[PDB]
């Protein structure tokens, strides 16, 4: 018993066939090609506002969210030349570029590859973009987190040259060495770790430094945390395993899950431990029903201790005990900040990561005129890196003129909010997210004002169009998860920190009825919160039973 | 185009946003209103309603003849709204 | 909050008596809504004839309960006479091995049902929110696992028979019976509250005042024999035997159902999951436990989502098993390996295994009328035969002395009934539901349109060059409720408009596979436009002996739609 996608991967000759023929046929491609083109970082979509108008979304690979100047410039131009005029920053520190016609697809990807970029493995049954702290801090543990993420991305990059064959016709030796060691490998294959069948499903890793949870670590297949040493010298990594947001409405055997603490490894061991984890998923882990394929389900089923022992077979030694860590703090990296080396960086707030019409033009003019590298954050924002102090004022002036605001001038709801693209181009969406979130945030602000909550107060709001959870709604203080054309499930219990799993509070709340739920919830928060207690902490301390009583009584 | 569809039911008046390519009964259902039906393909009279105002497109139905259509009868299972419309429901027994 | 109108009706009815009892005897040709809902539980349905455009003409359909499809001689004779005397001259064999008798006037309803009850029959629970007819292998084989499947189905039917006595009170003023004592193991299983299944003080120890959330369907068979279309049922029970053919236990599947509704994608057909295995002595306890789990947990707010299939879809099979295990009082064992399913029609001349023969009579759509009907009744009466109804709407003449083979064969041929060899193979595995004119849920024809469709399928085959011994399973319904189990067809037509069908593909000759919807709103007139390219591509690229069903699943809808659109 194996899924249709397994058979497709099997027959494809490492992701070439029949994609290769289909690419050069019709405005669309066949089902097999649709599945395969994902591994090369593109998705066939249709516009659901319209009557099948086909186009292709493309998604980049950018470990740590780092984007070289040359790539930003090419992406910016490609969006206008061959896309819909926008770049979409994502919750995994990546670009997406929507609306590409099939006849231009090879031109677009080839341009990406020739401009210090890649889409390889941006989708597919393989390692997705590896998260790291987006800020260009010079601090040691931050730099080391960033390097480690890059190493992991490279380690887990597909080695079949299928990508380069279709579209276009440095690596630290530690990575090559780790990749080549025998667990773990298929010694004679074009894919030493992935093999012919790749993974059972997408696989998501996040790396960070102790204390910094910009990366929403608990949500990933593997979370990697740099541990230091009283002087700030990295000595090793704590590891979490088995998080994921993906679930499906009315299928209670599907659920979001928080990664478990797995243990600690010395710094020199990291790539071996990671490969061991990946191989454990590769070998075990369901290929019959995609839906129960993510590593989270294997860990739910086995328990963390049996999983650890299995990983230890491929690692070749015992994980040490997970070391104590500081609390978790969310960091947006927005506004004007010091890198620590004399240069500045500026974090640009972007609602939903949607970079378009003028904001887009101005960003490109800045980036091009000062030759900046940039970085994408897991909250869909853009950091302008490596700024000389002398440039602070003209950059600030240019951004303000374009309508791009400093954090102090943005509603705090917006600063932490996220929504997925959903409609019109997502084929899974049940309702709006990106196109409906801004009016929702304004309504939340109006509920706060009516209730008497100060305009500096806020709550994390994350909206998706369906329960797949691409904006990580199940970590929100307030999550809306689309469950109908004009309705959302409301989730509560996430924290400002992203250290806590939300739970479903109510189903099928109609868009029009949102205030009927929110007003009593926030009235009770205002009325009985402890001093400075967040809505999230207040929700977990007070409990759903009391919150529902309050909602029903209203 | 989405239209305001007013349904006057024995339990009360209810207001819904029905898109132009969605049958009236199918939206009612989505919104958890209990309306009568049986065949759900326009060939009977279980879901019969009376248009008080506005208009519907119900060409997909085959039960009602034209005198009845002119008289404002509507089969709610096989009618798309073509304007803001007000419809009395549960009106089958006004015939058979 | 949140309980359906039918729940309140059951609640107010004093175990299915009130207001049915007073409505039955009112002057009107019909009965009120509450009575309409209640009379189902006594095995009758108020209908109206949709061919007559200007005015509701009321009548009552009646459906029997015949576990395994077994029909005693006395009952066949009574049903045959009732159909002519009080009905519309036909008996309708069904996909659950039952009779239906259409067209009874309200004023004759009590006479008809009473006659059924006095003639070794029953309609109790043939409809309603309870256990429907229990399927078993229809053939009167003397083989042990077949006999045991049949006995088990009967025991289950009896176990899940309503105990209130309301039925006998309404139809027979309370009398009788005579009938067999119910086997004591059934009574014992039913009584028995050692695991909290029952309402100890109630006229309904299992069902209570509310009965089930909805109809509930069980099929029992022997390993290998899928005449019962097992995967489709709430519970599928499979007799497992040792190497010698001695029954040792049962595998159990749970949570199938066909029912869905157009444009409500939260409704769907579903295949039953393997649940596990129980030793043979445990069966009624396991089954009751499954039924009680549905009784306690199935949705009673919205009837569309009440069937057990939804509970299992939602909970998953493991949580469902643990819940059933509370009421069973012990663990299921692991589901044992089974041989591959095979469809059997049981048609033609065969051996029972004891020296007597049986003959399976092919009947298109189970519609027994005019002459075929007359001749069948003459044979059955002359030779005093018991008979059996199959889940493919056919009739088996059981217990035939070898000496009678020739005169029976002569009488059947004279009546225009045919042996399988003289039937188009498309007909042999085809089924349609009654749909129009008496089904209130029908959106188009099924039974009245299927025979011309089969002949047009044959003409597509001939044109394409496919041999006339080749076939595909065709099943047609007038709406998406799926009474002819169309979602298990190689070719299913499911009514979605006055003269249109949704076409479903991907079922297999075996019924081991769930079809998927291929195209919507295919007009009756356009059928060839879809079928010709499909069957051309089947003929052109099938593997040796590969069925249209397996060919469909191997080739995939993407490539089939491309082929259909190119055409
Ligand atoms: C006669 C019979 C069809 C046949 O050609 O043989 C039949 C005929 C009707 N079925 Fe059925 N169903 C018959 C077996 C089935 C089956 C097959 C099976 O059970 O293996 C199914 C699909 C399996 C399932 O239950 O999902 C089936 C799914 C339905 C449904 C949808 C059920 C659901 O739970 O969604 C309805 C409507 C309802 O009850 O909601 C229904 C309701 C009906 C009604 C009674 C319409 C109504 O509710 O008033 C039918 C009357 C037609 C007429 O004028 O005679 N019938 N019905 C069936 C043989 C049944 C028997 O008990 O003796
Ligand atoms: C590709 C698709 C729809 C599809 O399958 O064709 C999709 C599939 C999915 C799907 C559906 C699937 O692929 O099965 C799922 C459910 C996966 C599962 O295992 O259950 C899903 C859970 C997420 C999750 C939850 C974590 C997880 O995987 O559980 C995350 C977050 C994370 O990784 O931290 C996520 C990160 C994005 N996901 Fe996602 N995701 C889509 C957008 C995104 C991006 C662009 C959202 C954003 O607002 O930033 C994502 C940013 C990520 C990136 O570049 O890699 C999206 C296209 C929408 C469009 O029109 O562009 N997706 N996406
Ligand atoms: S969460 Fe759902 S709707 Fe949103 S982008 Fe992901 S798949 Fe689409
Ligand atoms: S499938 Fe539909 S039309 Fe056919 S008998 Fe059943 S309910 Fe009636
Ligand atoms: S329910 Fe039969 S016409 Fe609408
Ligand atoms: Cl994704
Ligand atoms: Cl039925
Ligand atoms: Mg943002
Ligand atoms: Mg037949």
**Contact assignment for B17 to A484 by CB distance below 8 Å:** no
Q: How far apart are the first and last CA of chain B?
A: 33
Interface test with chain C among A3, A252, A300, A485, by most C beta carbons within 10 Å: A252
Q: Catalytic annotation on C127?
A: no
How many angstroms separate the Cα of C302 from the Cα of each of B32, C3, C7, C222?
Answer: 10, 7, 10, 35
- How far apart CA C541 and CA C539 sit, in angstroms, is 6
What distance in angstroms lies between residue C258's CA and the mean position of ligand 7's atoms?
Answer: 10
Q: Residue B3 sits in which domain range? A: 1-96
C439 is in an annotated binding site: yes
Find the DSSP H helices in A344-391: 359-369
Residues A378 and A416 in one domain: no
Residues A143 and A190 in one domain: yes
Q: Is C246 exposed, middle or buried (0-12, 13-18, 19+ CB in 10 A)?
A: exposed
- How far apart CA B79 and CA B62 sit, in angstroms, is 12
Four-point Cα dihedral A254, A258, A261, A264, nearest 10: 100
Quote the DSSP letter at residue C543: P
Say which CATH number the domain at C563 has: 3.30.413.10
Residues C242 and C370 in one domain: no
- How far apart CA A337 and CA A56 sit, in angstroms, is 37
Total domain count, chain B = 1
Tell whether omega for the bond before C437 is within 30 degrees of 0, i.e. cis: yes
Residues A49 and A133 in one domain: no
Tell how strand A478-484 and strand A461-464 pair up.
parallel
- How far apart CA A379 and CA A213 sit, in angstroms, is 11
Which ligand does the CA of C98 lie closest to? Answer: 1
Tell whether omega for the bond before C124 is within 30 degrees of 0, i.e. cis: no
Question: Reduced to 3 states, what is the DSSP secondary structure of residue A432?
Answer: coil
Interface test with chain C among B22, B23, B24, B41, by most C beta carbons within 10 Å: B41
Which of A421, A434, A346, A344 is closest to A382 using CA atoms? Answer: A346
Contact residues on chain C for A253, CB-CB shorter than 8 A: 315-316, 318-319
Residues A401 and A510 in one domain: no
A532 C-beta neighbours (distance < 10 Å), count: 7
Distance from B62 to chain A by nearest Cα, in Å? 28
The answer to whether C26 and C35 are in contact (CB under 8 A) is no
A123 is in an annotated binding site: no
* Tokens at B58, concatenated: 């119900």
- φ, ψ of residue A263 to 5 degrees: the values are 160, -170
C438 lines ligand 1 (CB under 6 A): yes
How many angstroms separate the Cα of A281 from the Cα of each of A241, A276, A487, C62, C541?
Answer: 11, 9, 36, 58, 38
User: Measuring from atom 53 of ligand 2, which residue has the nearest CA?
Assistant: A92
The reply to whether C315 touches chain A by the CB within 8 Å rule is yes
Name A228's bridge partners. A234
Q: Is the dihedral of CA C88, C90, C94, C97 positive or negative?
A: positive
Per-residue exposure over C459-483, b if at least 16 CB sit within 10 Å of its own CB, e if not: ebbeebebeeebbbbbbbbbbbbbb
Question: By what method was this entry solved?
Answer: X-ray
Question: Reduced to 3 states, what is the DSSP secondary structure of residue C519?
Answer: strand
A470 is in an annotated binding site: yes
Task: Report residue C433 CA to chain centroid gap.
Answer: 11
Q: Which of C338, C369, C404 is the last residue of a domain?
A: C338
Q: Catalytic annotation on C433?
A: yes
* Chains touching C, CB cut-off 8 Å, 3+ pairs: A, B
Q: Which of A390, A410, A430 is the last residue of a domain?
A: A410
What distance in angstroms lies between residue A97's CA and the mean position of ligand 6's atoms?
Answer: 14
B10 C-beta neighbours (distance < 10 Å), count: 8
Contact residues on chain C for A4, CB-CB shorter than 8 A: 556
DSSP string, A235-268: EEEEEEE--B---BTTBTT---BPPEEEEEEEGG
Length of chain C: 567
Residues A418 and A448 in one domain: yes
* Tokens at A488, concatenated: 């959302």
Interface test with chain C among A21, A26, A31, by most C beta carbons within 10 Å: A31
Q: Which residue out of C211, C483, C504 has the highest number of ligand 1 atoms within 8 Å of its CB and is therefore the one to mutate? A: C483
A211 C-beta neighbours (distance < 10 Å), count: 14
- How far apart CA C363 and CA A119 sit, in angstroms, is 62
Say which CATH number the domain at B16 has: 3.10.20.30
Total domain count, chain A = 3
What distance in angstroms lies between residue C448's CA and the mean position of ligand 4's atoms?
Answer: 13
* Tokens at A524, concatenated: 């009770």
How big is chain A by its Cα radius of gyration, in Å? 23
- How far apart CA C305 and CA C266 sit, in angstroms, is 9
Which of C524, C517, C521, C466 is closest to C491 using CA atoms? Answer: C517
Q: Catalytic annotation on C53?
A: no
Resolution of the experimental model, in Å, one decimal: 2.2
Task: Report residue C282 CA to chain centroid gap.
Answer: 25
The reply to whether B96 touches chain C by the CB within 8 Å rule is yes
Distance from C520 to chain A by nearest Cα, in Å? 16
* Tokens at A113, concatenated: 């590859």
Q: Which of C423, C438, C463 is the last residue of a domain?
A: C423
Residues C325 and C403 in one domain: no
Residues A544 and A446 in one domain: yes
Task: Point out the ligand 4 atom lying closest to the alpha carbon of residue C442.
Answer: 3
Distant-in-sequence contacts of A45-52, Cβ < 8 A, 24+ apart:
A45/A98, A45/A425, A45/A426, A45/A427, A46/A425, A46/A427, A47/A424, A47/A425, A48/A423, A48/A424, A48/A425, A48/A427, A48/A429, A49/A423, A49/A424, A52/A28
Q: Residue C75 sits in which domain range? A: 1-126+339-423
Question: Reduced to 3 states, what is the DSSP secondary structure of residue A389?
Answer: helix
DSSP string, C24-49: TTSSSSS--HHHHHHHGGGTEEEEE-
Which of A59, A109, A69 is closest to A353 using CA atoms? Answer: A59
Q: Is B1 exposed, middle or buried (0-12, 13-18, 19+ CB in 10 A)?
A: exposed
Helices A270-283 and A173-180 meet at what angle, rounded to 10? 40
A161 C-beta neighbours (distance < 10 Å), count: 12
Residues C13 and C105 in one domain: yes
**Contact assignment for A484 to B30 by CB distance below 8 Å:** yes
Q: Is the dihedral of CA B47, B50, B56, B61 positive or negative?
A: positive
Chain A contacts in chain B segment 24-53 (CB below 8 A): 30-31
C193 C-beta neighbours (distance < 10 Å), count: 11
Q: How far apart are the first and last CA of chain C?
A: 54
Residues C132 and C38 in one domain: no
Residues, beta carbon < 5 Å, ion ligand 9: C 392-394
The answer to whether A87 and A360 are in contact (CB under 8 A) is yes
Residues A216 and A298 in one domain: yes
Residues C98 and C9 in one domain: yes
Quote the DSSP letter at residue A122: S
């Amino acid at each position: 018993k194996r899924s249709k996608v397994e058979i497709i991967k099997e027959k494809s000759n490492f992701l070439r066939y029949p994609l290769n023929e289909e690419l050069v046929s019709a405005p669309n491609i066949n089902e097999s090609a649709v599945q395969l083109i994902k591994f090369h970082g593109s998705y066939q979509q249709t516009d659901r506002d319209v009557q099948k108008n086909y186009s292709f979304m493309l998604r980049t690979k950018n470990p740590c969210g780092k984007v070289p100047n040359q790539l930003y410039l090419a992406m910016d131009t490609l969006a206008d030349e061959f896309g819909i005029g926008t770049l979409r920053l994502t919750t995994r520190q990546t670009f997406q570029l929507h609306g590409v016609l099939k006849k231009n697809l090879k031109t677009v990807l080839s341009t990406v590859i020739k401009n210090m970029g890649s889409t390889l493995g941006a989708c597919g049954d393989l390692n997705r973009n590896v998260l790291a702290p987006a800020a260009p801090y010079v601090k040691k543990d931050i730099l080391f987190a960033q390097q480690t993420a890059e190493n992991i991305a490279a380690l887990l990059t597909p080695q079949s040259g299928a990508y380069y064959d279709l579209w276009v016709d440095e690596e630290p030796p530690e990575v090559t060495k780790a990749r080549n060691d025998n667990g773990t490998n298929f010694p004679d294959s074009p894919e030493p770790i992935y093999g012919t069948q790749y993974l059972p499903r997408k696989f998501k890793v996040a790396v960070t430094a102790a204390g910094d949870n910009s990366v929403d670590i608990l949500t990933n297949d593997i979370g990697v945390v740099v541990v230091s040493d009283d002087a700030g010298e990295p000595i090793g990594f704590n590891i979490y395993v088995g998080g994921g947001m993906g679930r499906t409405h009315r299928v209670e055997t599907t659920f979001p899950r928080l990664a478990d603490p797995l243990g600690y490894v010395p710094k020199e061991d990291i790539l071996y431990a990671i490969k061991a984890i990946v191989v454990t998923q590769r070998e075990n882990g369901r290929r019959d029903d995609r839906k129960y394929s993510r590593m989270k389900y294997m860990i739910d089923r086995w328990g963390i201790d049996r999983f650890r022992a299995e990983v230890e077979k491929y690692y070749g030694k015992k994980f040490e005990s997970f070391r104590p860590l500081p609390e978790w703090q969310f960091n947006s990296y927005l506004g004007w900040q010091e890198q620590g080396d004399g240069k500045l960086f500026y974090g640009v707030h972007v609602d939903n990561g949607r970079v378009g019409g003028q904001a887009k033009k101005t960003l490109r003019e800045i980036i091009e005129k000062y030759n900046l590298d940039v970085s994408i954050t897991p909250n869909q924002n853009l950091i302008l890196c490596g700024i000389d102090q002398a440039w602070r004022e003209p950059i600030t002036t240019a951004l303000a003129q374009a309508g791009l605001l400093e954090p102090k001038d943005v509603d705090p709801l917006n600063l932490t909010a996220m929504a997925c693209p959903a409609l019109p181009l997502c084929p899974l969406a049940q309702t709006e997210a990106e196109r409906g979130i801004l009016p929702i945030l304004k309504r939340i602000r109006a509920v706060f004002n009516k209730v008497g909550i100060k305009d500096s107060e806020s709550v994390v709001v994350r909206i998706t169009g369906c329960p797949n959870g691409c904006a990580r709604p199940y970590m929100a203080e307030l999550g809306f998860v689309g469950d109908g054309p004009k309705s959302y499930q409301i989730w509560l219990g996430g924290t400002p920190n992203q250290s806590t799993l939300a739970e479903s509070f109510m189903d099928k709340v109609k868009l029009d009825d949102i205030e009927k739920v929110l007003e009593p919830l926030f009235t009770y928060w205002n009325g009985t919160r402890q001093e400075g207690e967040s809505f999230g902490s207040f929700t977990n301390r007070t409990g759903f039973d009391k919150l529902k009583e309050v909602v029903n009584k209203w | 185009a989405t239209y305001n569809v007013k349904l006057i039911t024995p339990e009360g008046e209810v207001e819904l946003q029905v898109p132009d390519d969605v049958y009236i009964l199918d939206q009612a259902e989505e919104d958890g209103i209990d309306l009568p039906y049986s065949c759900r393909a326009g060939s009977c009279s279980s879901c019969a309603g009376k248009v008080v105002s506005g208009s519907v497109d119900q060409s997909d139905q085959s039960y009602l003849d034209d005198g009845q259509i002119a008289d404002g009868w509507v089969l709610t299972c096989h009618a798309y709204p073509t304007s803001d419309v007000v419809i009395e429901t549960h009106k089958e027994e006004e015939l058979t």
